[PDB]
Amino acid sequence: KYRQLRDLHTLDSHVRGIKKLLEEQGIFLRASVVTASSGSALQYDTLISLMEHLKACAEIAAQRTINWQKFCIKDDSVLYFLLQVSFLVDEGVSPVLLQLLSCALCGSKVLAALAAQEDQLCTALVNQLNKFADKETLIQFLRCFLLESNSSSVRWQAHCLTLHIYRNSSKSQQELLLDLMWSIWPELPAYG
């Protein structure tokens, strides 16, 4: 129990800090949507203070994934918030956000195999993310992390994350996701 209390409190505090930091620069999460008032990019100090929190969260989620999954179940506005904020932050931080999403959704043993109760938690988290996320945000995620990214590791992470989001969904959401991908397809020549 002791490890669970420590981990839950630490992750809670880190999310409060991240939300306060983003609020300081005009990034507002009202009900479930993240809105930006200023089109100017963030500064180095803000990025480093974000990265320390996200690195702590990534380490704790990678060591003991169950507590992180339990957190994301308890607080329903965490995974979608990270997905939304991954659009506003430069390419230097996106790997850690994708790692957090992958640990929450793809699972721990799957990532361990790639390195060569959790199933129900993964299913529930995937259903929650499907419920919150709309079609435009999914389209933006696919376009931004599978086509526009110059790094190949980020593209592979997006590949795995999309695959495991597809695997754990229901039939109607699978059809919706396939239609989204097939509508993206005609824009292929722009990415080579």
Side-chain angles (χ1 to χ4, degrees), residues 79-100:
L79 286 179
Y80 196 55
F81 167 63
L82 290 181
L83 202 143
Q84 294 257 23
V85 81
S86 94
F87 298 153
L88 323 169
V89 160
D90 68 354
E91 272 288 339
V93 152
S94 302
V96 85
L97 299 165
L98 280 176
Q99 162 166 330
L100 283 176

Side-chain angles (χ1 to χ4, degrees), residues 17-190:
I18 278 154
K19 279 186 183 175
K20 180 157 109 152
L21 222 57
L22 265 285
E23 277 266 331
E24 275 200 54
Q25 267 83 348
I27 292 320
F28 294 149
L29 168 75
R30 324 311 271 151
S32 293
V33 293
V34 165
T35 72
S37 64
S38 47
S40 176
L42 312 181
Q43 272 64 239
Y44 189 81
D45 326 300
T46 306
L47 293 186
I48 212 68
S49 39
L50 225 63
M51 191 75 198
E52 74 155 28
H53 282 305
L54 286 175
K55 182 53 182 103
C57 283
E59 165 278 332
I60 178 189
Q63 292 329 305
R64 312 180 279 290
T65 310
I66 301 101
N67 299 346
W68 170 245
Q69 277 169 344
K70 285 180 189 172
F71 191 3
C72 288
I73 288 171
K74 204 204 290 203
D75 193 3
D76 63 345
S77 78
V78 165
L79 286 179
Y80 196 55
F81 167 63
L82 290 181
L83 202 143
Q84 294 257 23
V85 81
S86 94
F87 298 153
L88 323 169
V89 160
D90 68 354
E91 272 288 339
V93 152
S94 302
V96 85
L97 299 165
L98 280 176
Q99 162 166 330
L100 283 176
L101 267 296
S102 172
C103 281
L105 304 158
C106 302
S108 71
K109 58 183 183 297
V110 198
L111 284 173
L114 283 173
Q117 198 68 289
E118 67 279 350
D119 292 329
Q120 182 186 319
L121 305 186
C122 287
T123 304
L125 292 168
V126 165
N127 303 132
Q128 158 194 339
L129 210 185
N130 279 121
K131 154 213 181 193
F132 284 120
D134 62 345
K135 141 179 74 38
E136 268 156 350
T137 302
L138 284 175
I139 282 294
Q140 200 62 53
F141 165 74
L142 293 165
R143 192 191 262 103
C144 217
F145 288 111
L146 271 183
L147 302 173
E148 271 186 19
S149 191
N150 205 79
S151 170
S152 44
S153 300
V154 177
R155 265 178 289 158
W156 279 123
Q157 278 178 355
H159 162 99
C160 164
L161 182 60
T162 307
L163 167 68
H164 286 113
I165 281 180
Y166 165 90
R167 252 174 200 166
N168 284 331
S169 304
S170 65
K171 157 193 173 301
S172 62
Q173 308 152 323
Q174 279 174 350
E175 300 200 6
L176 181 88
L177 185 64
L178 178 67
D179 213 18
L180 291 182
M181 252 164 177
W182 269 110
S183 68
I184 292 202
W185 157 267
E187 315 168 13
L188 205 75

